[PDB]
Symmetry: C2
Subunit: 194 residues, 2 copies
């Protein structure tokens, strides 16, 4: 298994060194000191590699995937999103690596449980689904922006000036927590109306 090999740690390191673009099975094979047929025996192509990496990031850094019992659905959602975000930021291009990942048998177990929890709070199955996907889409989107501008990082109009300096002083986390609260609060308003 990849479990008993240094393939994942070696790819994770290469990822940090060159990013998802420069990460190829060829370079990984050279990093490992082996030729390609042997790396192929461990993992078949870059997509299968990224999948494994995505899941390792989740395994290592995605703490709050199911709700603490007694925890409100609002709290579950906040902490789930923060936890997913921490996973995506744990490595370079973590969000791009996640994109296109095939959920595992466990990720379905975990997503059945999440749907069970919200429907118990009076979300229709539809709205539970939409709620988790909106939080997920928002978070993925944020981290993608964030990670693309970690790379980049008067006559000017006041409002634009204020908005730029805002992100220099405060970074991306307040914007993240703000959008997350806008979502959770919007769910409450929507639930109430329906």
């Amino acid at each position: 298994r990849l479990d008993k090999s240094k393939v994942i740690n070696s790819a994770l390191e290469l990822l940090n060194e060159v990013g998802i673009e420069g990460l190829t099975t060829r370079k990984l094979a050279q990093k490992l000191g082996v030729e390609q047929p042997t790396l192929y025996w461990h993992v078949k192509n870059k997509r299968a590699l990224l999948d494994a990496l995505a899941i390792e990031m989740l395994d290592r850094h995605h703490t709050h995937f199911s709700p603490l019992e007694g925890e409100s659905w609002q709290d579950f959602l906040r902490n789930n999103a923060k936890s997913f975000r921490n996973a995506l930021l744990s490595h370079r291009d973590g969000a791009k690596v996640h994109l296109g990942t095939r959920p595992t048998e466990k990720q379905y177990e975990t997503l059945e449980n999440q749907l069970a929890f919200l429907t118990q709070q009076g979300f229709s199955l539809e709205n539970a689904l939409y709620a988790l996907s909106a939080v997920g889409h928002f978070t993925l989107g944020s981290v993608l922006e964030d990670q693309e501008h970690q790379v980049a990082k008067d006559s000017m109009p006041p409002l634009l000036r204020q908005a730029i300096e805002l992100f220099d002083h405060q970074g991306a986390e307040p914007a993240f927590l703000h959008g997350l609260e806008s979502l959770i609060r919007g769910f409450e308003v929507q639930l109430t109306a329906l």
Copy 2:
């Protein structure tokens, strides 16, 4: 001319996707030698910038409020407009990712912040509201297009089985519309707060 290059580049994108897309492929698609194309597009990053910008010119048409329009309706129409641009071509959302903004887009950002503040939103609330909508929209189309690529419901657990079956029936749009409303309500609640 550049119109020929861009239209041909858009076709190639639809044919081969963002990953198959190269300036080499584009040159041998067009009539021309690679150094000829170079003067239109330096490299893949420049090509992708040009395509992202073209999808926005063509389809992202609701970047400023049409006056009379409520801030809510503007935010809706802006987000749907933006989504249309990303969905207009294969891998549009990935093409958009990592494009730097033009001076015009910054000029647009000024106007939008001015507009939302005029409704009573703090600048910080204006700014974070706009990013939330943009980030939600981008993330949606990404996983949507990413899911479109996918080409077993009856083997998986009860609720999830029903949930995904629901997703296939009513495609991706309803989830997007609903999440867009949720952001808008969250914003409205901020609007009615004694202290933003």
